[PDB]
Write a protein that binds this ligand. Structure first.
Ligand SMILES: Clc1cnc(NC2CCOCC2)nc1
Length: 345
Protein backbone atom coordinates (compact mmCIF):
# COMPACT_ATOMS: atom_id res chain seq x y z
CA UNK A 1 0.00 0.00 0.00
CA UNK A 2 1.26 3.51 -0.96
CA UNK A 3 -0.04 7.12 -1.42
CA UNK A 4 0.95 9.98 -3.81
CA UNK A 5 4.57 10.94 -4.61
CA UNK A 6 5.94 14.05 -2.79
CA UNK A 7 9.00 16.10 -3.95
CA UNK A 8 9.46 19.59 -2.35
CA UNK A 9 6.33 19.87 -0.17
CA UNK A 10 3.98 19.63 -3.25
CA UNK A 11 1.95 16.54 -4.28
CA UNK A 12 3.50 15.27 -7.54
CA UNK A 13 0.94 12.56 -8.29
CA UNK A 14 2.18 10.59 -11.33
CA UNK A 15 2.50 6.97 -10.13
CA UNK A 16 2.61 4.00 -10.32
CA UNK A 17 3.83 4.30 -13.98
CA UNK A 18 6.29 7.13 -13.14
CA UNK A 19 8.70 6.59 -10.22
CA UNK A 20 12.13 7.68 -8.93
CA UNK A 21 11.45 11.45 -9.18
CA UNK A 22 14.10 14.21 -9.15
CA UNK A 23 13.23 17.91 -9.00
CA UNK A 24 14.27 20.01 -12.09
CA UNK A 25 12.71 23.44 -11.57
CA UNK A 26 9.60 25.64 -11.76
CA UNK A 27 7.59 25.75 -14.99
CA UNK A 28 4.69 28.12 -15.78
CA UNK A 29 1.88 26.93 -13.48
CA UNK A 30 3.82 24.39 -11.44
CA UNK A 31 6.76 22.10 -10.66
CA UNK A 32 8.94 20.25 -13.21
CA UNK A 33 10.46 16.85 -12.39
CA UNK A 34 12.16 13.98 -14.15
CA UNK A 35 10.82 10.43 -13.47
CA UNK A 36 11.54 6.84 -14.50
CA UNK A 37 8.82 5.57 -16.92
CA UNK A 38 8.25 1.89 -16.02
CA UNK A 39 6.47 1.11 -19.40
CA UNK A 40 9.02 2.50 -21.88
CA UNK A 41 11.93 2.06 -19.37
CA UNK A 42 13.38 5.58 -19.82
CA UNK A 43 13.48 8.69 -17.68
CA UNK A 44 10.98 11.36 -18.84
CA UNK A 45 10.20 14.99 -18.06
CA UNK A 46 6.94 15.79 -16.19
CA UNK A 47 5.31 19.21 -15.67
CA UNK A 48 2.51 19.75 -13.15
CA UNK A 49 -0.11 22.29 -14.32
CA UNK A 50 -2.83 23.67 -11.99
CA UNK A 51 -4.81 26.12 -14.19
CA UNK A 52 -8.48 25.66 -13.28
CA UNK A 53 -9.10 28.72 -11.07
CA UNK A 54 -8.02 31.19 -13.90
CA UNK A 55 -9.37 31.55 -17.44
CA UNK A 56 -6.03 32.79 -18.92
CA UNK A 57 -4.16 29.76 -17.39
CA UNK A 58 -6.94 27.48 -18.76
CA UNK A 59 -6.70 28.98 -22.27
CA UNK A 60 -2.92 28.57 -22.36
CA UNK A 61 -3.01 24.97 -21.04
CA UNK A 62 -5.60 24.01 -23.63
CA UNK A 63 -3.67 25.70 -26.50
CA UNK A 64 -0.45 23.90 -25.61
CA UNK A 65 -2.22 20.56 -25.33
CA UNK A 66 -4.27 20.93 -28.54
CA UNK A 67 -1.28 22.16 -30.64
CA UNK A 68 1.27 19.64 -29.32
CA UNK A 69 -1.13 16.68 -29.72
CA UNK A 70 -1.83 17.70 -33.37
CA UNK A 71 1.80 18.41 -34.23
CA UNK A 72 4.27 15.65 -34.99
CA UNK A 73 7.82 16.82 -35.85
CA UNK A 74 11.38 15.85 -34.90
CA UNK A 75 12.12 19.50 -33.86
CA UNK A 76 8.97 19.98 -31.80
CA UNK A 77 8.53 18.52 -28.34
CA UNK A 78 5.70 16.03 -28.21
CA UNK A 79 3.36 14.98 -25.47
CA UNK A 80 3.96 11.30 -24.52
CA UNK A 81 1.31 11.04 -21.80
CA UNK A 82 -1.06 13.23 -19.75
CA UNK A 83 -1.98 12.23 -16.12
CA UNK A 84 -5.09 13.55 -14.45
CA UNK A 85 -7.94 12.34 -12.26
CA UNK A 86 -10.63 10.10 -13.82
CA UNK A 87 -13.50 12.61 -13.26
CA UNK A 88 -13.86 16.42 -13.85
CA UNK A 89 -14.68 16.75 -10.11
CA UNK A 90 -11.48 15.06 -8.86
CA UNK A 91 -9.22 16.75 -11.45
CA UNK A 92 -7.18 19.51 -9.81
CA UNK A 93 -3.79 19.09 -11.51
CA UNK A 94 -2.71 17.91 -15.00
CA UNK A 95 0.71 16.33 -15.54
CA UNK A 96 2.24 16.46 -19.04
CA UNK A 97 4.87 13.78 -19.78
CA UNK A 98 7.49 14.65 -22.41
CA UNK A 99 10.80 13.37 -23.64
CA UNK A 100 13.57 14.19 -21.10
CA UNK A 101 16.11 16.53 -22.71
CA UNK A 102 19.68 17.06 -21.26
CA UNK A 103 19.48 20.86 -21.31
CA UNK A 104 18.10 23.97 -23.03
CA UNK A 105 19.76 26.70 -25.10
CA UNK A 106 19.47 29.29 -22.27
CA UNK A 107 21.56 27.12 -19.91
CA UNK A 108 23.94 26.17 -22.68
CA UNK A 109 24.60 29.81 -23.65
CA UNK A 110 25.30 30.76 -20.05
CA UNK A 111 28.04 28.02 -19.79
CA UNK A 112 29.34 27.00 -23.32
CA UNK A 113 31.05 28.60 -26.30
CA UNK A 114 29.30 27.38 -29.46
CA UNK A 115 31.38 26.38 -32.52
CA UNK A 116 30.20 27.82 -35.85
CA UNK A 117 29.16 24.22 -36.74
CA UNK A 118 26.95 24.01 -33.62
CA UNK A 119 25.33 27.46 -34.32
CA UNK A 120 24.59 26.34 -37.87
CA UNK A 121 23.02 23.05 -36.78
CA UNK A 122 21.00 24.67 -34.01
CA UNK A 123 19.73 27.44 -36.38
CA UNK A 124 18.88 24.78 -39.00
CA UNK A 125 16.76 22.75 -36.54
CA UNK A 126 14.97 25.87 -35.18
CA UNK A 127 13.98 26.97 -38.71
CA UNK A 128 13.03 23.35 -39.73
CA UNK A 129 10.68 23.16 -36.72
CA UNK A 130 9.42 26.68 -37.40
CA UNK A 131 8.67 25.77 -41.03
CA UNK A 132 6.30 23.10 -39.79
CA UNK A 133 4.68 25.41 -37.20
CA UNK A 134 4.12 28.24 -39.71
CA UNK A 135 2.84 25.73 -42.36
CA UNK A 136 0.10 24.85 -39.81
CA UNK A 137 -0.83 28.58 -39.80
CA UNK A 138 0.38 28.79 -36.17
CA UNK A 139 2.68 31.41 -34.60
CA UNK A 140 4.77 30.31 -31.64
CA UNK A 141 5.08 33.91 -30.27
CA UNK A 142 7.59 33.19 -27.48
CA UNK A 143 10.68 31.80 -29.14
CA UNK A 144 13.74 32.25 -26.87
CA UNK A 145 16.68 30.11 -25.70
CA UNK A 146 14.85 28.58 -22.66
CA UNK A 147 12.14 27.27 -25.04
CA UNK A 148 14.68 25.34 -27.09
CA UNK A 149 15.49 21.96 -25.59
CA UNK A 150 18.70 19.99 -26.45
CA UNK A 151 19.65 16.34 -25.92
CA UNK A 152 23.18 15.00 -25.35
CA UNK A 153 23.80 14.79 -29.16
CA UNK A 154 22.51 18.37 -29.75
CA UNK A 155 19.12 17.44 -31.32
CA UNK A 156 16.86 20.40 -30.71
CA UNK A 157 13.16 20.60 -29.91
CA UNK A 158 10.93 23.66 -29.71
CA UNK A 159 8.73 23.76 -26.62
CA UNK A 160 6.10 25.88 -24.81
CA UNK A 161 3.17 26.70 -27.09
CA UNK A 162 1.22 28.46 -24.30
CA UNK A 163 1.34 31.87 -26.07
CA UNK A 164 0.79 30.47 -29.58
CA UNK A 165 -1.96 31.80 -31.90
CA UNK A 166 -3.40 31.11 -35.29
CA UNK A 167 -1.93 33.64 -37.73
CA UNK A 168 -4.25 36.57 -38.39
CA UNK A 169 -2.36 39.12 -40.51
CA UNK A 170 -5.41 41.19 -41.61
CA UNK A 171 -6.03 42.04 -37.87
CA UNK A 172 -2.40 42.72 -36.95
CA UNK A 173 -2.65 46.50 -36.66
CA UNK A 174 -2.84 48.38 -33.38
CA UNK A 175 -1.71 51.62 -31.73
CA UNK A 176 1.56 52.74 -30.26
CA UNK A 177 2.80 51.23 -26.96
CA UNK A 178 0.04 48.49 -26.86
CA UNK A 179 0.76 46.05 -24.10
CA UNK A 180 2.17 42.68 -25.06
CA UNK A 181 2.73 39.31 -23.29
CA UNK A 182 5.76 37.61 -25.02
CA UNK A 183 9.35 37.82 -23.72
CA UNK A 184 10.76 41.37 -23.94
CA UNK A 185 14.27 40.69 -25.33
CA UNK A 186 12.89 38.64 -28.36
CA UNK A 187 10.07 41.13 -29.32
CA UNK A 188 10.16 42.54 -32.81
CA UNK A 189 10.23 46.32 -32.99
CA UNK A 190 6.76 46.55 -34.57
CA UNK A 191 5.22 45.15 -31.29
CA UNK A 192 6.03 48.47 -29.60
CA UNK A 193 4.84 50.55 -32.61
CA UNK A 194 1.80 49.07 -34.38
CA UNK A 195 1.55 45.21 -34.31
CA UNK A 196 -0.40 42.71 -32.22
CA UNK A 197 2.06 39.91 -33.12
CA UNK A 198 -0.39 38.10 -35.42
CA UNK A 199 2.03 37.55 -38.36
CA UNK A 200 4.74 34.92 -38.97
CA UNK A 201 7.35 37.69 -39.17
CA UNK A 202 7.11 38.00 -35.36
CA UNK A 203 8.71 34.56 -34.93
CA UNK A 204 11.46 35.26 -37.49
CA UNK A 205 12.57 38.33 -35.42
CA UNK A 206 12.84 36.10 -32.33
CA UNK A 207 14.93 33.55 -34.18
CA UNK A 208 17.16 36.42 -35.39
CA UNK A 209 17.70 37.44 -31.74
CA UNK A 210 18.52 33.80 -30.84
CA UNK A 211 21.03 33.59 -33.69
CA UNK A 212 22.73 36.84 -32.48
CA UNK A 213 22.80 35.37 -28.95
CA UNK A 214 24.44 32.12 -30.21
CA UNK A 215 27.12 34.27 -31.84
CA UNK A 216 28.24 36.10 -28.62
CA UNK A 217 26.55 34.26 -25.65
CA UNK A 218 24.80 37.59 -24.74
CA UNK A 219 21.29 38.81 -25.65
CA UNK A 220 21.59 41.28 -28.53
CA UNK A 221 18.78 43.62 -27.32
CA UNK A 222 18.60 43.33 -23.51
CA UNK A 223 15.97 46.00 -22.78
CA UNK A 224 14.90 46.63 -19.14
CA UNK A 225 11.35 47.75 -19.93
CA UNK A 226 8.78 48.18 -22.64
CA UNK A 227 10.05 51.16 -24.67
CA UNK A 228 13.75 50.48 -23.70
CA UNK A 229 13.45 47.38 -25.93
CA UNK A 230 12.93 49.64 -28.96
CA UNK A 231 15.95 51.86 -27.73
CA UNK A 232 18.18 48.74 -27.94
CA UNK A 233 16.90 47.68 -31.41
CA UNK A 234 17.31 51.11 -33.01
CA UNK A 235 20.70 51.46 -31.31
CA UNK A 236 22.00 48.63 -33.60
CA UNK A 237 19.74 48.80 -36.67
CA UNK A 238 19.94 52.63 -36.73
CA UNK A 239 17.18 55.08 -37.67
CA UNK A 240 14.52 53.60 -39.98
CA UNK A 241 14.48 54.68 -43.61
CA UNK A 242 11.82 56.96 -44.96
CA UNK A 243 10.26 54.01 -46.78
CA UNK A 244 10.09 51.96 -43.60
CA UNK A 245 8.58 54.92 -41.67
CA UNK A 246 5.97 55.39 -44.48
CA UNK A 247 4.66 51.86 -43.72
CA UNK A 248 3.85 52.99 -40.13
CA UNK A 249 0.63 54.92 -40.74
CA UNK A 250 -0.24 55.37 -37.04
CA UNK A 251 0.82 58.94 -36.18
CA UNK A 252 1.85 58.39 -32.56
CA UNK A 253 4.24 55.60 -33.64
CA UNK A 254 5.57 57.52 -36.67
CA UNK A 255 6.07 60.76 -34.79
CA UNK A 256 7.85 58.95 -31.94
CA UNK A 257 10.28 57.60 -34.42
CA UNK A 258 10.71 60.98 -36.16
CA UNK A 259 11.43 62.64 -32.76
CA UNK A 260 14.58 60.62 -32.22
CA UNK A 261 18.06 61.85 -33.14
CA UNK A 262 19.68 60.07 -36.05
CA UNK A 263 21.30 56.67 -35.14
CA UNK A 264 23.74 54.92 -37.44
CA UNK A 265 23.55 51.23 -38.19
CA UNK A 266 26.13 49.22 -36.24
CA UNK A 267 27.74 46.79 -38.80
CA UNK A 268 27.14 43.17 -37.87
CA UNK A 269 30.83 42.29 -38.53
CA UNK A 270 31.86 44.86 -35.83
CA UNK A 271 29.37 43.39 -33.27
CA UNK A 272 30.36 39.83 -34.22
CA UNK A 273 33.98 39.92 -35.39
CA UNK A 274 34.47 36.07 -35.20
CA UNK A 275 31.14 35.22 -36.93
CA UNK A 276 30.83 33.46 -40.27
CA UNK A 277 29.97 36.10 -42.93
CA UNK A 278 27.04 33.98 -44.27
CA UNK A 279 25.65 33.72 -40.71
CA UNK A 280 25.74 37.59 -40.53
CA UNK A 281 24.01 37.92 -43.90
CA UNK A 282 21.15 35.72 -42.70
CA UNK A 283 21.06 37.55 -39.32
CA UNK A 284 20.66 40.89 -41.16
CA UNK A 285 17.72 39.48 -43.12
CA UNK A 286 16.00 38.07 -39.96
CA UNK A 287 16.58 41.32 -38.03
CA UNK A 288 15.06 43.58 -40.70
CA UNK A 289 13.08 46.51 -39.13
CA UNK A 290 10.29 46.40 -41.68
CA UNK A 291 8.39 43.11 -41.08
CA UNK A 292 7.16 43.03 -44.73
CA UNK A 293 10.83 42.94 -45.88
CA UNK A 294 11.90 40.40 -43.20
CA UNK A 295 12.95 37.00 -44.54
CA UNK A 296 10.38 34.12 -44.27
CA UNK A 297 11.16 30.72 -42.77
CA UNK A 298 11.38 28.87 -46.04
CA UNK A 299 13.70 31.59 -47.47
CA UNK A 300 15.84 31.38 -44.37
CA UNK A 301 16.21 27.59 -44.76
CA UNK A 302 17.37 28.15 -48.42
CA UNK A 303 20.01 30.75 -47.32
CA UNK A 304 23.67 29.79 -48.17
CA UNK A 305 24.62 29.69 -44.48
CA UNK A 306 22.41 26.50 -44.12
CA UNK A 307 23.42 24.94 -47.51
CA UNK A 308 25.00 21.84 -45.84
CA UNK A 309 21.66 20.92 -44.27
CA UNK A 310 19.03 22.39 -46.62
CA UNK A 311 16.76 19.74 -48.08
CA UNK A 312 13.11 20.81 -48.62
CA UNK A 313 12.03 17.16 -49.06
CA UNK A 314 13.25 16.51 -45.49
CA UNK A 315 11.69 19.67 -43.98
CA UNK A 316 8.11 18.53 -43.63
CA UNK A 317 4.97 20.60 -43.39
CA UNK A 318 1.75 19.99 -41.41
CA UNK A 319 -0.96 17.83 -42.97
CA UNK A 320 -3.75 19.74 -41.09
CA UNK A 321 -3.26 23.49 -40.46
CA UNK A 322 -5.32 25.12 -37.67
CA UNK A 323 -11.40 30.39 -26.95
CA UNK A 324 -11.07 34.09 -25.78
CA UNK A 325 -14.63 34.34 -24.32
CA UNK A 326 -15.09 30.66 -23.14
CA UNK A 327 -15.01 30.74 -19.29
CA UNK A 328 -12.78 28.56 -17.10
CA UNK A 329 -15.54 25.94 -16.38
CA UNK A 330 -16.02 25.19 -20.09
CA UNK A 331 -12.24 25.27 -20.60
CA UNK A 332 -11.93 22.60 -17.84
CA UNK A 333 -14.32 20.38 -19.82
CA UNK A 334 -12.31 20.99 -22.96
CA UNK A 335 -9.01 20.14 -21.13
CA UNK A 336 -10.71 17.05 -19.59
CA UNK A 337 -11.95 16.08 -23.13
CA UNK A 338 -8.59 16.80 -24.85
CA UNK A 339 -6.72 14.53 -22.28
CA UNK A 340 -9.21 11.61 -22.34
CA UNK A 341 -7.19 9.55 -24.87
CA UNK A 342 -4.41 8.99 -22.25
CA UNK A 343 -6.75 7.45 -19.67
CA UNK A 344 -7.20 3.78 -18.89
CA UNK A 345 -10.39 2.96 -20.83
CL1 LIG B 1 9.57 19.22 -21.43
C1 LIG B 1 11.20 19.14 -20.80
C2 LIG B 1 11.66 20.10 -19.91
N1 LIG B 1 12.90 20.06 -19.42
C3 LIG B 1 13.67 19.05 -19.85
N2 LIG B 1 14.93 18.99 -19.37
C4 LIG B 1 15.57 20.04 -18.58
C5 LIG B 1 16.80 19.48 -17.91
C6 LIG B 1 17.54 20.57 -17.18
O1 LIG B 1 17.92 21.63 -18.07
C7 LIG B 1 16.76 22.25 -18.64
C8 LIG B 1 15.94 21.26 -19.44
N3 LIG B 1 13.32 18.08 -20.71
C9 LIG B 1 12.06 18.15 -21.18
Amino acid sequence: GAGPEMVRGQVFDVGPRYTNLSYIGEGAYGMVCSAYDNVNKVRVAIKKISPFEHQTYCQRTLREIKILLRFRHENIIGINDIIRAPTIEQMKDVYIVQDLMETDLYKLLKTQHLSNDHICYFLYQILRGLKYIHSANVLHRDLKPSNLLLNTTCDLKICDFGLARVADPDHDHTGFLTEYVATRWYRAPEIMLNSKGYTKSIDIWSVGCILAEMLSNRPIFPGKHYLDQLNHILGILGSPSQEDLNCIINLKARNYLLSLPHKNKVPWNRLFPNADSKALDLLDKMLTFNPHKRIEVEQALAHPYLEQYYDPSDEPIAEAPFLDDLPKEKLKELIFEETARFQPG
